Amino acid sequence: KVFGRCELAAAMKRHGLDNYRGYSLGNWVCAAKFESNFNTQATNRNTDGSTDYGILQINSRWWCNDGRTPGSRNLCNIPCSALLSSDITASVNCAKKIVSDGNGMNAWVAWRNRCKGTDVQAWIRGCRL
Ligand SMILES: [Cl-]
Ligand SMILES: [Cl-]
Ligand SMILES: [Cl-]
Ligand SMILES: [Cl-]
Ligand SMILES: [Cl-]
Ligand SMILES: [Cl-]
Ligand SMILES: [Cl-]
Ligand SMILES: [Cl-]
Ligand code: NA
């Protein structure tokens, strides 16, 4: 599923992500924009052999099981395929664990490089929320 901008903002808010760990909704929409262009089916291989999955490009080295990432963990206790669903529940629940891990949203390199410090409220501007 390819979400619209305000559609994803509303789904993220319904699943409790708005101001989760102090990160406003626009931070989450901005990260999803540059991780996946709002496409739940996005996948991307990493040089280390792990793979990133879903709207927030959650990585198989630590967070989900895909059966082909040697030495990895599955700390969200989910198959990585669950992160590609049109229903964003699994991605949101796992992102809550990731953002709580110690470094906040810097866990998402693209958030640090393209969202951090910017006018992230622009990503939810105009949306009925
Ligand atoms: Cl957009
Ligand atoms: Cl918010
Ligand atoms: Cl915001
Ligand atoms: Cl594995
Ligand atoms: Cl594990
Ligand atoms: Cl599994
Ligand atoms: Cl959803
Ligand atoms: Cl933080
Ligand atoms: Na894994």
Side-chain angles (χ1 to χ4, degrees), residues 5 12 19 21 28 34-35 55 58 79 86 93 105 113 117:
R5 177 177 61 86
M12 283 176 160
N19 215 30
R21 284 286 170 150
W28 295 103
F34 294 125
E35 290 297 354
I55 51 164
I58 291 173
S86 57
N93 288 349
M105 288 195 73
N113 287 329

Side-chain angles (χ1 to χ4, degrees), residues 59-75 78 80:
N59 190 252
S60 65
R61 173 139 313 282
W62 289 104
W63 305 109
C64 61
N65 179 56
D66 65 8
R68 65 171 199 193
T69 310
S72 70
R73 302 286 291 275
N74 177 12
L75 296 178
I78 50 166
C80 297

Side-chain angles (χ1 to χ4, degrees), residues 12 17 19-36 52 55-57 95 98-99 102-121 123:
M12 283 176 160
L17 212 47
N19 215 30
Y20 191 86
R21 284 286 170 150
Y23 288 93
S24 65
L25 189 55
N27 280 284
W28 295 103
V29 174
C30 184
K33 171 75 178 176
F34 294 125
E35 290 297 354
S36 67
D52 290 351
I55 51 164
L56 285 167
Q57 288 292 275
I98 296 168
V99 75
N103 295 327
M105 288 195 73
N106 298 286
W108 289 272
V109 173
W111 175 86
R112 178 170 57 79
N113 287 329
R114 308 178 73 173
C115 300
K116 188 177 185 177
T118 73
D119 177 20
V120 295
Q121 195 275 337
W123 291 101

